[PDB]
Amino acid sequence: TQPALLRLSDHLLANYKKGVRPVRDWRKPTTVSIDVIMYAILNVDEKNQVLTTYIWYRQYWTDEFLQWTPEDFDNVTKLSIPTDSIWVPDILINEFVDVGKSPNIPYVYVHHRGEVQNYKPLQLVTACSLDIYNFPFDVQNCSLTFTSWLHTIQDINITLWRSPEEVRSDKSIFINQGEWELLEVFPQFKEFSIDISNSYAEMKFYVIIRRRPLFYAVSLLLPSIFLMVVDIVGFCLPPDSGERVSFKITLLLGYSVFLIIVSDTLPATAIGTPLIGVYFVVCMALLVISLAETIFIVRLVHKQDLQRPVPDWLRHLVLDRIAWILCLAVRGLLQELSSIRHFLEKRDEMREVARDWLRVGYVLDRLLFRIYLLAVLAYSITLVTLWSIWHYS
Amino acid sequence: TQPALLRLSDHLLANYKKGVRPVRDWRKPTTVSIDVIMYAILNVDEKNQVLTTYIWYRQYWTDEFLQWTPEDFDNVTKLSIPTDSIWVPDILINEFVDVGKSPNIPYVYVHHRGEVQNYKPLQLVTACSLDIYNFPFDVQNCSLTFTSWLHTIQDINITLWRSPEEVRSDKSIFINQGEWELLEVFPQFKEFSIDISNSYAEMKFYVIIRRRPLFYAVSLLLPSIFLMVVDIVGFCLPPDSGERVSFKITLLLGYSVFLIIVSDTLPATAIGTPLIGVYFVVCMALLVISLAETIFIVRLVHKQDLQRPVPDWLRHLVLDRIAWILCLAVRGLLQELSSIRHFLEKRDEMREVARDWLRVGYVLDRLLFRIYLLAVLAYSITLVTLWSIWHYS
Amino acid sequence: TQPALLRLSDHLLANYKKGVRPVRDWRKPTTVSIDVIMYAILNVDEKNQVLTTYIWYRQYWTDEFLQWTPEDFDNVTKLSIPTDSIWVPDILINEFVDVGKSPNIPYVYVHHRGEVQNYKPLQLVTACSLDIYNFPFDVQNCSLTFTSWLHTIQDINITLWRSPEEVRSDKSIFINQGEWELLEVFPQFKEFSIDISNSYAEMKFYVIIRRRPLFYAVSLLLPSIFLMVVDIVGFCLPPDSGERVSFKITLLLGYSVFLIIVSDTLPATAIGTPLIGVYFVVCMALLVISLAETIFIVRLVHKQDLQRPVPDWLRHLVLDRIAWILCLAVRGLLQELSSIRHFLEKRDEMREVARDWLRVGYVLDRLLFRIYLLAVLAYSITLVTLWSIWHYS
Amino acid sequence: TQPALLRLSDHLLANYKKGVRPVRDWRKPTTVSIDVIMYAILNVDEKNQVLTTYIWYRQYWTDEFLQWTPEDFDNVTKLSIPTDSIWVPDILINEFVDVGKSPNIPYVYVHHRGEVQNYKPLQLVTACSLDIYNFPFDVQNCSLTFTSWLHTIQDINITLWRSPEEVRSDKSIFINQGEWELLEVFPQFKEFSIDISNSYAEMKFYVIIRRRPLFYAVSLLLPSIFLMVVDIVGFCLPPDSGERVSFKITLLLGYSVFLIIVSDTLPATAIGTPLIGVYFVVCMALLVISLAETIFIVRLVHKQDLQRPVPDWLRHLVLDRIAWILCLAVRGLLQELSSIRHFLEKRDEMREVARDWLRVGYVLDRLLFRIYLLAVLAYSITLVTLWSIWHYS
Amino acid sequence: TQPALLRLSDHLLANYKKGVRPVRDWRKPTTVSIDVIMYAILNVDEKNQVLTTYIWYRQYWTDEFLQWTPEDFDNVTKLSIPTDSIWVPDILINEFVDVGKSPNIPYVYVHHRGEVQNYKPLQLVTACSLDIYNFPFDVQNCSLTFTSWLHTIQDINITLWRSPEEVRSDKSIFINQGEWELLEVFPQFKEFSIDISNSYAEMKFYVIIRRRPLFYAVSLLLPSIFLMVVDIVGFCLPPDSGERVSFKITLLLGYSVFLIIVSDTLPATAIGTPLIGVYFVVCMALLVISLAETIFIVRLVHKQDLQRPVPDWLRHLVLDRIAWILCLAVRGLLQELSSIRHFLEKRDEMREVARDWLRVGYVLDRLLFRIYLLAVLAYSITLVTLWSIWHYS
Ligand SMILES: *[C@@H]1O[C@H](CO)[C@@H](O[C@@H]2O[C@H](CO)[C@@H](O)[C@H](O)[C@H]2NC(C)=O)[C@H](O)[C@H]1NC(C)=O
Ligand SMILES: *[C@@H]1O[C@H](CO)[C@@H](O[C@@H]2O[C@H](CO)[C@@H](O)[C@H](O)[C@H]2NC(C)=O)[C@H](O)[C@H]1NC(C)=O
Ligand SMILES: Cc1nc[nH]c1CN1CCc2c(c3ccccc3n2C)C1=O
């Protein structure tokens, strides 16, 4: 009879047992040939050391029992069979820490020599070690290891579909504009063993990704450069005005409020902070020097029952530092008038010695303003020198 | 016998095999005709580049084996059959990154020529690229690509149910008032291929949505306009009062606290900030100019052992800038009295030279108050000019 | 034989096909009678427009094939049958956006005329439109629409179990004390159609709920009334003390910190803020008037090389505003003494003209203190007048 | 033959129907005997009124069809059978609002008289009413009601395994150190009915738990006591120094910042705040009195063109309050000298009347410092008196 | 016939019953030998007392019914069988509070004597008690107890695969760099019993882990050391400048803002705060002493109608504390001139007595500056002494 070509499928699955590993001779292994394309990097968790990706996967193997001649079946050379009717190998990942939700694919291809092809997408929640020592300019190297979980090397061996050079140079479908950049995917065959007499075939894929360091660079420099500019403008306040101290402590208050927002959005691993955490406490201690310079000079020019300064410490300040660096009734009358002259004289002499301290506090202020402005320019061009040698190639 | 019309269903499913693709001739493909109505936009994730929608889906195909004449079955022309008793094609989406939870529909229709109709709702968690360069006034363009995952173009081809003009103009059931606005849904047929000799039918639906920019506009201008008004009122403080500097640094402190709440609720992609991030740092640097204008003028009118100002720099300030822009016992007595006259004279001459600097600091203050008020009005009407040319049509 | 009364169930399920819609004549529809009691309002999401409830559901229909006479089965009139052995209709909701987790009920009742009764609880995650224009005093109106997803009006029709007046007045089991208050549940029959020749039976239940506006009212007035009381106490500071300006800007700083916590806990839809967002910016601008009143009067009473004020602007201030509203050696001596008289005279005349400005700044201060206190009392009793007409009935 | 004792299980399950309620006579109900041990309190959600626990559950019933004599089966008196091969009753909870994830137990015991024993653990997500009127010192009373969802009182009745005194005094395995303390679990039998002619057996377990109020007490008093101590130290500043007002408004600013962190971590139900919310606004208004005492006394001792105070209001302040509570050329000369005497006399008389107001502002300051220190000590020992009568027994 | 070696599997599973515990004699128990390797510590929840790990698990037992001679089956000594075709024991954990998501392994090994080997990975969500008394330097000790949930000691007994010394010293695959450090895994056999006549075999594994205390130590000392350095610099302000009080209250404000971020990220159990919570309130009260030292000395050097100080309290301050520790018309003229001498004399004598109080306030200031600097150095080297004795071994 010739009803249709559903007479192939019941010829092929009349007495078929889906629990038996499909070989005629039990001494020969089943060889599974796999292949991978990366599709998206969904999440990189630096705190929990967990990577979440999404790949497209395919594999084939040889089934000794699903064979037919294409004649006597109207030249059919392949057909589709449900997945839960045949033997399927158990290929897992060593680095699993969870189970991702993936769509179910209910069909496979079967060619007329026994080659069974399986296509399925996979969401992977794996665990890889993440070092963040140079935090925005970092390249990560995480691994995917496909292996058979039960069967040993004498039952299931794993090979590649195609050559490892075609797998390495494949970035055709990768979803970009998403904060991570795929560089390469490199395969490598190894053989796993913990104890003796049990070896397991495995196939490591190394996934190398790189962070796009643009929006971390503007969301961490644009407040850092800004609060340095406001500190430079605050030196132009005169120190005997009672406002420079209140300026510097408010701005130092507003800067410490900023760092606790930075640590809220930027994590750190068990080795500690990255290298840019050093460059924040250098800009922190550079404001405490400007605070200690203000408190040192407000103590200087202030009116406390003063004496005339040291003639040694006036001579090499006023003269040298501006040249090397900068540019019965009758006689009862005048006895009372001499007393009135005396109270005005002590008022004037305490006033002119307050001027001599005030002249010292202004030559020494423009001296320390130019030393501070020299240090914040030498450190600023150092920070852009190290960046510009990175950016080339 | 005539028991009921359950004698149709066992005639139709006596020897039926749900794993075989239902054709008499294996050389002809099965053609699936699909159709879509968008129901809700559930979530748009700008950070992770993930779109979450909810659609209503339907499809039909032709089954060669489910055919009957309507006579000898009491004129039955269609009936309902459980879904897990027949062959169902595997239509997926390329852009899946997750599996949404959808209700199960356990029945299908079957007409008497073999047409099998399937209705089901779907929740879709897809991945599309989102550019936010003009952040509240942005139109997104994300894609849905329906394809068969295993079968090639020689087995399953995908067509539309109805015309592509009826699909494009369908906004009948879309749930509004929910922060996104559906513009159109446009279908397009393509043919997918990565390697040679394997082509897959696909059907792209382009979903174009647009953000409603109302409550982002009031939750970002109403604090931005407000802290500009408070800065204008603070110029009316007199500069030799010791409070204008403390006014400006508190208000600049409270403005920098505001931006870190803005970045907490407004994300940015890998290309960086949107265009309105430029318009925040222009309003930022416009407050530092008002801070540097205060510190420049407090340094001017302040009492430090002063000299009389330059007659050149007084003449074109006091005169020109207000006209072009603005509107033995006896002889021992008087020798002591001349000394008492001398201490009061140095007290008065240091007082009148502090007035001459104070007159300079007030002509120059109302000059810089009108230049600053001219710039904050020219920039404010520029910002509403660019908005009003957008709003028309 | 008479073994037991398991001989009923195998008589009833010997040749039973659970895929066939159970009618003798295929032209007559199956009528499903439903009923609902609301149990809890779990979540109302104003941002995503999503409602989450939990109901108790029941339904019955007529099965033509499950019929027996109660004699010859020892007078059994009903029995329980597993759910997955019989035909069950597919009743869904139009407003689904998710799938809730509900317990499984594995049994149904079957009476001896064919009536099959089904009881099950359901968790529903639906989508309804939420307007929050009057934010704590708001009544919402969301919908639940039970319909058959595949079968049309010629196969499945939906009716009510009991009368629509018994469904409307049922609040027996509703879990209270949980921030929402159930008012009524009102049913209504409609008939759904998008295209021609396909009509679907549906049954809308309108669920009307009302927010309990107690703890939103104390967590939004008790800081709003408090920072108005502190502003009233701050007018009693004297204006020529240098502390009133620093008082008002700190309190205005602490008030703007408060609103960004309010917007963090209170959402807004696409139409913008509710009506109480207007009543916050009225209390905002009422503090800027008190700030501008302080800066206007500190500029007035301050010692800058002053002149005597206008006699017109002193006469209607000092006199009128307090009445209509408030309540050779010898001749060389005295030439020097006349100079000493002259320096003390210019010191005294600049002191008495600073008193005349100081008298103006205190009559005008108590005038503007009573105008401000009149406005904050007229607006406060207006705000309680609008509340008291709401509270009655 | 005697192969093994798998000949018992096929004798026992040859013709067994798992859909039939297992009685010989259909008029007799099946009696289910249950038992509970509480294992952990996982979550108590005060906002959503949801309790999450984890119990260990067991139950037995009598199966008329699973009976054998132990002879002719090698003295087997019990054996284990898979769960999905026999009839299982449907015991649910009325208070479900979700479905918890519990491990599956695939086996049951069967004794030779028909007693079928079932052991399983359960995670329960229920809804109970939570009153938090005394927030850390609160005892909650939530309920668990086990009932049959479909079958009425004529089919399934629920009893206890063991006595209700053994269930009440069982705290053997409860995981402690986890913020809630289990007091007792008390069972009670009732009979549920909404309409007539349908009654359902139920079994309420009352679960009484109590919060451990230790770390809420130190995380709410240690900032509350601290900002009261800082306010006491700030009275020792002299009031005519211009810093006491700036002290009090900064500290009142920092206290209002603290309460918005308290409301972020401590929820409130629909009845409003707990009783300790009253004790925060008493400590709030106790700082406004210290603020209004400062502003009242800075207005007093301040130099505005003053007059001598009232002799009545000086006599009962300076004298009484310290005793009852505290402890041609020649004649042209002296006409000019009398003028110079006159300008120094008006300078001195305006200075001594500023001392007389300054003496009033210091007797009245130490008076109001001791009244304020008496109120903050009488309220502090009241707050520890109410705590110490609670702590005993 | 000799078709293949699928003739072994149908010989082995022709009449096999997967519900029967596989023994020939029912009096002998089934012995299960287990083994564990820890792979990752996923989460340690200190608030909810919940541990989340991920292990690799394996077990074997003896099946009396799956036996064959390897001859007459072409020398096959083992083969793989699906898991859902044979009897599997029910090994659970006592400490479950949830169900983790683990991958499914669908195959087992079967040797020719009946030994059935099972390999599977497991995610475990257990509940262990966590004491955090020494918060970063803490070692936890949580438990895993494998037991059979239904069967007693006469049915299932649990043993180890390999020796307990090989299990204890196994850290081969543990994923490091993830904030917790695995020390050892120690097994122990016990026997569980609540009531009489029912004993259950169990096998406790003790898991000892240790926190890596590096990044908690820098994120809690680097702001704590920093705000102590800023307080030392603030003593160099002169006390009669009106800025030291405003310095100390701003810095004390900014320190109390810091602790509420610390408690947000660091939890505490029911016993209260850890030991480092004591070391924060010691650094808290060390700033209130510096605040009370400032307010005590501003009250001292301030100009209120002063008297000369006590000669006893000047002698042991000025002299001792610097030595032991530190280093008709005519007669009408002069009657008026004596009055002018009198007003200048009272002006001078009130000025020199303000100097004598000012000298006292500076000897006493450098005295209390060196006592405070001695206490903050003795406590700082104590804090590093206790750390250095911990770090050695
Ligand atoms: C809730 O909303 C519905 C809107 O559908 C209101 O529905 C109307 O109800 C009346 C009868 O009460 C009908 O005549 C109208 O045809 C309904 N409208 C529509 C569009 O069908 C309902 O009244 C609302 N409930 C409350 C309490 O306001
Ligand atoms: C917990 O709440 C229940 C409320 O149902 C209390 O229940 C009452 O218990 C007494 C006996 O103790 C019965 O006589 C009452 O009929 C019960 N009330 C109701 C409404 O049924 C129970 O006592 C409470 N437990 C505690 C410790 O307070
Ligand atoms: C909502 C409902 N209520 C009962 N049944 C249905 C299903 N409903 C029926 C009509 C319908 C659907 C559909 C889907 C895609 C394109 C066009 C479509 N049309 C015209 C389909 O979802």
Residue numbers in the entry:
A (entry chain D), B (entry chain E), C (entry chain A), D (entry chain B), E (entry chain C): 8 to 334, 397 to 462
What wording appears in the published article?
Serotonin binds to serotonin receptors (5-HT3Rs), a pentameric ligand-gated ion channel (pLGIC), on the vagal afferent nerve in the gut and on the chemoreceptor trigger zone in the brainstem leading to severe nausea and vomiting in patients receiving cancer treatments. Setrons, competitive antagonists of 5-HT3R, are effective in the prevention of chemotherapy-induced nausea and vomiting (CINV), radiation therapy- induced nausea and vomiting (RINV), and postoperative nausea and vomiting (PONV). In the present study, we have solved cryo-EM structures of the full-length 5-HT3AR in complex with palonosetron, ondansetron, and alosetron at the resolution range of 2.9 Å to 3.3 Å. Overall, setrons stabilize 5-HT3AR conformational states that are non-conductive, but appear to lie between the apo and serotonin-bound states.
For example, the FDA approved treatment of diarrhea-predominant IBS with alosetron led to severe ischemic colitis in many patients. Iterative classifications and C5 symmetry-imposed refinement produced a final three-dimensional reconstruction at a nominal resolution of 3.3 Å for 5-HT3AR-Palono (with 91,163 particles), 3.0 Å for 5-HT3AR-Ondan (67,333 particles), and 2.9 Å for 5-HT3AR-Alo (42,065 particles). The aromatic end of the molecule is an indazole in granisetron, isoquinoline in palonosetron, carbazole in ondansetron, and pyridoindole in alosetron. In particular, the carbonyl oxygen of Trp156 is close to the amine group of setron, and in the 5-HT3AR-Alo, it forms a hydrogen bond with the amine group in the diazole ring. In 5-HT3AR-Alo, one of the secondary amine nitrogen on the diazole ring forms a water-mediated hydrogen-bond interaction with the carbonyl oxygen of Trp156. The backbone oxygen of Tyr64 interacts with the carbonyl group of the ligand’s pyridoindole ring through a water molecule. Interestingly, water-mediated interactions with Glu209 are absent in the alosetron fingerprint when compared to the ondansetron, granisetron, and serotonin fingerprints. In comparison to the 5-HT3AR-Apo structure, Loop C adopts varying degrees of an inward conformation, and in the 5-HT3AR-Alo structure the orientation is similar to 5-HT3AR-serotonin. Comparing these two parameters across the different systems suggest that Loop C is stable in its initial cryo-EM conformation in the case of 5-HT3AR-Alo and 5-HT3AR-Serotonin simulations where it predominantly adopts a ‘closed’ conformation. We find that the 5-HT3AR-Alo and 5-HT3AR-Serotonin MD simulations maintained an interaction between Arg65 and Asp202 more often than in any other setron-bound structure, and that most setron-bound simulations did not appreciably form this stabilizing interaction.
